């Protein structure tokens, strides 16, 4: 909602910031083994815990 | 051109605080250059100045 507490807004801020693709230069690191961010979250698919 | 802990140790509180202030104004300038494009040389000095501030503060404490 528009009305939110500071704790809720700060929780939503961190969830937003980590919902981004991996940098492309990660894939060139030695012994990488990581293809893409498997923890990507879409707002419509999966709802947040709170 | 760097700062080291050993040659900071003979200095007095006033000139240690002055050296802390000069590093802090340079770090703020580097953060300005970071958000205005800047250069790779200016971006890489951010860590150098940040470690210098930690070095001065460690000696002070």
């Amino acid at each position: 909602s528009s009305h939110k507490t500071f704790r809720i807004k700060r929780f939503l801020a961190k969830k937003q910031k980590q919902n981004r693709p991996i940098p492309q230069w990660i894939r060139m690191k030695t012994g990488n083994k990581i293809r893409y961010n498997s923890k990507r979250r879409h707002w419509r698919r999966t709802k947040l815990g709170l | 051109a760097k700062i080291k802990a050993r040659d900071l140790r003979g200095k007095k509180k006033e000139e240690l605080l002055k050296q802390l202030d000069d590093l802090k104004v340079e770090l703020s300038q580097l953060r300005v250059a970071k958000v205005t494009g800047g250069a790779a040389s200016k971006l890489s000095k951010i860590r150098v100045v940040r470690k210098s501030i930690a070095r001065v503060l460690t000696v002070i404490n």
Binding site: - | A33, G38, A39, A40, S41, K42
Partner: protein
Amino acid sequence: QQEQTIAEDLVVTKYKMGGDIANRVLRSLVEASSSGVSVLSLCEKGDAMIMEETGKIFKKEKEMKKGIAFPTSISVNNCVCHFSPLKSDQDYILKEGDLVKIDLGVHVDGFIANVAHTFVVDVAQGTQVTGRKADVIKAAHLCAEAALRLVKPGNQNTQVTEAWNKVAHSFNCTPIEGMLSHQLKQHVIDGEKTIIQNPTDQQKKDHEKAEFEVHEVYAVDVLVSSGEGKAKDAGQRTTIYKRDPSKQYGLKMKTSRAFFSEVERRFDAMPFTLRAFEKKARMGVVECAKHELLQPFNVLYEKEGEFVAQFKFTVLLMPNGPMRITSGPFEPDLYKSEMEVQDAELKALLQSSA
């Protein structure tokens, strides 16, 4: 189709006076540049002399625009080119024996005339300049003489590139990586026909094959370093910008719109400098460049202790002989080198004159 070519007598004559006005201001710059002078002072007086000379010329016709085609670019001992400080930027004082690289262009009726020359200020009488600096300027001038000889319809643009690479390898030096000469026509400085200098894989495969054609101008550039040829930036403000009329965008800034209109009024498509305004100019330029209305001409630094030289000039391509309209004052009697040229083909081209 509507471009104007050099087949007309009046177009020929105004090129001759366009390079004449370019040569006399470069000559005035070289004499005036000495020890204890300010680069900002040189840029302003070199620009001011252009303004009054191009204003007093053709007093009977006051309709067609005349002005600067490239701002005075003075780079000394650490910068490649595209360097012109503002008033706020700290000045550079000229020490003894510094090599300086001066760029200067002037356009009449939309056709440009671009000249540039590298020289060392305050050459003492009775002495001889010796060092690793001795070879870079001399080899660059031999590139200018070579390109002057081999500019002709039928000689491919690639033959220019490996010839410059060959003489650079003769002097055990390398050019600046990926510098760009251009083919010139009316009201443009960035024609599609282009010449690459010291390429790599990326540049050579994005570059084009072309054959020299009659009735067109060539701003050919030699630019050789004494180190590795690599370049980058060191947090210095970009001053030279040029308007690209291909694209447009709705500017949402009042100061940027006023700045962009003043660019269109004075320097409609030719490159300009931020010195020609200042507080609002540096404000509107960023939001114009962000949406790519102006193409930045950034400053390029080599590593400390390296020295770089350059020459460039506009040569008209006319069938039975090409002529160099603008020339810089280079004299090989007062300047020698510790290594020479050892290729017979290079000997043939230098000895045969146009």
